[PDB]
């Protein structure tokens, strides 16, 4: 029983917000959870051992290294609490989980984009650094597939990137894989059926509706059916076999909708319009 979590981001009020929402795809019901303690946009989120983590971001003054955590208990009325902060302030980082641990890569501290990635273990409540990527990247999503971590595209502060990097646990080093066809920053990323889908983003002149999928077994990219609207700073997650693109910015308006890519139909369906309007929010999946 998997539901979708959407946290923080940039709201219609034209500032960072603290709204936490849950979307249940079966019933299509939305509900609010407890708001996070600091308003944060350009923010990342992951779920791990039935706890929600809100990571870094930008409160309208500073890029943040702080981290908030919510125990997703069954008795409701919970409280966010602060946990160990990252080693480095990161707005527009990519985050994922592998095993008992959060991994967070790239981002922006207000001065530089990061090559560094770091990981968190909730049993010791501490962050530690890992290998540096070859290119510093913000707006680059992070996906783990078959024990290998991928950091896709982004923005190095000069160019939007089509390059993709993979992290080899045998070596602790990053190397390049085949790049995407389009350069994208702020695209949504997610793993579905051994493919890494990249949805939307911005290519340096246009907000993108396009989608490509990386076949990990053949190190090759193909074009996937386009989304119903362009979406930049869009989160993407997978849930019972389908891919969801969550809100975002279409180049003109903040979106309140979620469209779902069903590979059975190989096309996108808008499935809800009733979320908060926002972009660069954190998204993750919870079981209940």
């Amino acid at each position: 029983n998997e539901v979708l979590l959407v946290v923080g981001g940039f709201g219609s009020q034209q500032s960072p917000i603290d709204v936490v929402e849950k979307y249940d795809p079966k019933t299509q019901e939305w509900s609010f959870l407890p708001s996070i303690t600091r308003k944060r946009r350009y923010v990342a989120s992951v779920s791990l051992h039935d706890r929600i983590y809100v990571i870094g971001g930008y409160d309208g003054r500073s890029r943040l290294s702080s981290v908030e955590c919510l125990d997703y208990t069954a008795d409701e009325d919970g409280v966010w609490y602060s946990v160990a902060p990252m080693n480095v302030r990161r707005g527009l980082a990519g985050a994922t989980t592998l095993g008992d641990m959060i991994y967070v890569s790239g981002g922006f501290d207000g001065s530089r984009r990061h090559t560094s990635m770091e990981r968190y273990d909730p049993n010791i409540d501490q962050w530690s650094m890992l290998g540096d990527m070859q290119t510093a990247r913000e707006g680059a999503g992070l996906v783990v597939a078959s024990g290998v971590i991928y950091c896709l595209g982004g923005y190095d502060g000069l160019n939007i990137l089509n390059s993709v990097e993979k992290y080899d646990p045998h070596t602790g080093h990053w190397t390049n894989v085949t790049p995407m066809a389009t350069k994208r920053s702020g695209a949504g990323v997610a793993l579905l059926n051994d493919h890494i889908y990249v949805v939307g983003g911005f290519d340096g002149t246009a907000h993108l509706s396009s989608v490509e999928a990386y076949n990990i077994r053949t190190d090759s990219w193909t074009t996937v059916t386009s989304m119903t609207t362009p979406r930049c700073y869009v989160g993407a997650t997978v849930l019972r076999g389908r891919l969801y693109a969550i809100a975002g910015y279409d180049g003109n308006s903040l979106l309140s909708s979620i469209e779902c890519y069903d590979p059975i139909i190989d096309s996108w369906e808008v499935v809800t319009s009733m979320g908060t309007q926002r972009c660069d929010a954190g998204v993750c999946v919870l079981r209940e």
């Binding site: 923005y155 702020g186 911005f202 910015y249 660069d280």
Partner: peptide, 8 residues
């Protein structure tokens, strides 16, 4: 909000 393609 000076991120490439982000809202003003």
């Amino acid at each position: 909000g000076q991120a490439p393609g982000a809202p003003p």
